[PDB]
């Protein structure tokens, strides 16, 4: 607080509108270069013309302020009249580039507004993701690196902007999930994937399931009927309470009637593997809506298969092979050699009992690149680490530090020196 009292705090944080504008400008530069450059030229022109109008107003007010005599008896009045006529002509001509700017902004809006909304949603889910496991904290430069991978490395690179936008969106979702979940635990992969599924659903001619998702997230925490015990014909007390809590949904109204009407449906909803075949029903329903209804039914009936049902929902929403690369082994060579800046250290956070030093040394043997592996924990080790870092920056070799988590008080200036 002694330092807090003496200074005026100013935060340059990132907002939704600023992120949307930056991502829209980047998309314009990547896709429509001449259109983006003429747009920028027109904004610069509009700013210059507005400055000229302000100069006109100030000059006219100053000239009429200090005439020091009759207006009709001076020629300076005539000169100011001529200048005002010229500036009236240019403010009249301003309407043409105003209309051209209007055409430009409507075109870019109708072409790339949902993409920028997806940009904002994905990056702010990315920032809010840090509330789980304290370990991942993704910065804005990480998202910008994702965009430099998406827009500038287009697989199967087309020459059609309408389908190129959809290709960019799908590739963005896929590589965002790949790059984030490459550095998370396996328990949070499904959470991140279904958050991205929610973003994709929000970004699309599909009705929003706001009440459905609100009840899915806050169905157990909501208050249910007290003392109302349904039939225990084929459902336990917990399943009956879940059915009671679900029954307030308008789509699932006569669930109590339906479960006993489908008396033969004791296998499609109980035992076996219910994630594949789901009984009952939620008008032609969309496949995503059917997946949502099946997910709610699974959460009400068999909470064990909730992970499988969420995986199937993610598969139906973003593609069957959306998260089929996580179970593949980690191809670290291409990731290091292609998508890692030399100024960014490669963090390898490992659970106890499973190290990565063998992986790094195998990489060194494969690429035939020399490494000084230095074990952190002594003053001599710190000096050797600084010397090796300086030599590696000068020459171009790789430097490796092991058991890095034993000196945060040194990691602070290590990060500062790296920056």
């Amino acid at each position: 607080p002694d330092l807090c009292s003496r200074v005026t705090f100013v935060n340059f944080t990132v907002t939704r509108s600023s992120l949307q504008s930056q991502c829209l400008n980047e998309v314009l530069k990547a896709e429509r270069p001449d259109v983006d450059e003429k747009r920028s030229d027109l904004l610069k022109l509009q700013g210059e013309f507005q400055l000229r109008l302000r100069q006109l107003e100030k000059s006219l007010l100053q000239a009429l302020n200090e005439v020091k005599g009759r207006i009709l008896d001076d020629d300076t009045i005539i000169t100011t009249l001529e200048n005002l006529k010229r500036e009236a002509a240019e403010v009249t001509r301003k309407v043409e580039e105003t209309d051209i700017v209007m055409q430009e902004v409507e075109t870019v809006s109708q072409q790339y507004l949902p993409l920028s909304t997806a940009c904002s949603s994905i990056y702010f889910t990315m920032e809010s993701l840090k509330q789980i496991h304290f370990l991942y904290q993704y910065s804005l430069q990480f998202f910008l690196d994702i965009y430099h991978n998406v827009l500038y490395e287009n697989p199967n690179l087309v020459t059609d902007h309408t389908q190129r936008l959809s290709i960019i969106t799908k590739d963005l979702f896929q590589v965002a999930f790949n790059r984030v979940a490459r550095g998370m635990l396996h328990q949070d992969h499904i959470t991140f994937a279904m958050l991205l599924a929610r973003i994709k659903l929000k970004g699309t001619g599909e009705p929003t399931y706001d009440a459905e998702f609100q009840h899915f997230l806050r169905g157990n925490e909501i208050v249910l009927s007290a003392g109302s015990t349904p039939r225990i014909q084929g459902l336990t007390v917990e399943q009956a309470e879940a059915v009671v809590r679900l029954s307030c949904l308008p789509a699932f109204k006569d669930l109590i009637a339906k479960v006993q009407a489908d008396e033969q449906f004791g296998i499609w909803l109980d035992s076996s593997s219910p994630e594949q075949t789901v009984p009952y029903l939620w008008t032609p329903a969309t496949p995503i809506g059917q997946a949502i209804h099946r997910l709610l039914l699974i959460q009400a009936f068999r909470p064990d298969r909730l992970l499988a049902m969420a995986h199937m929902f993610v598969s139906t929403n973003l593609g069957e092979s959306f998260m089929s690369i996580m179970e593949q082994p980690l191809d670290l060579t291409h990731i290091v050699g292609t998508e890692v800046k030399p100024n960014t250290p490669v963090l390898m956070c490992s659970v106890p009992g499973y190290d990565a030093s063998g992986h790094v040394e195998d990489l060194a043997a494969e690429q035939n690149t020399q490494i000084t592996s230095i074990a952190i924990g002594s003053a001599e080790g710190f000096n050797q680490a600084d010397k090796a870092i300086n030599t590696a920056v000068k020459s171009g070799r790789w430097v490796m530090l092991k058991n890095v988590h034993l000196a945060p008080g040194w990691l602070m200036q290590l990060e500062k020196k790296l920056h």
Binding site: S5, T8, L61, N65, V67, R70
Partner: protein
């Protein structure tokens, strides 16, 4: 007291004023009926108090918090004084230019 002492020199008095029926009072022993400078000093005190409340609410929510100090209140009242003086002076200057312009065009 510090707000009323710091904002005593300026022309904050309004001959016409309407006392609110809701009478939002945060400072005890506020004179009744309050005047314009009393009302705006009480409003400044309320601004400090509601920043106390907002900071406590953010700390309860869970986000990281930063302590607020009477130096902030002194900075705010200095900013109020400087901005009031600057805005009044520039508005008077622009009105003088506009009035002499109307006089000249009438001539």
């Amino acid at each position: 007291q510090v707000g009323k002492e710091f904002t005593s020199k300026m022309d904050l008095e309004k001959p016409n004023y309407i006392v609110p029926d809701y009478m939002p009072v945060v400072y005890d022993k506020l004179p009744q009926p309050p005047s314009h400078r009393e009302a705006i000093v009480n409003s400044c005190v309320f601004v400090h108090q509601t920043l106390h409340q907002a900071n406590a609410r953010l700390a309860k929510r869970g986000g990281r918090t930063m302590a607020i100090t009477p130096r902030h209140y002194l900075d705010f009242i200095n900013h109020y004084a400087n901005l009031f003086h600057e805005k009044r002076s520039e508005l008077e200057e622009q009105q003088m230019h506009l009035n002499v312009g109307l006089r000249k065009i009438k001539e």
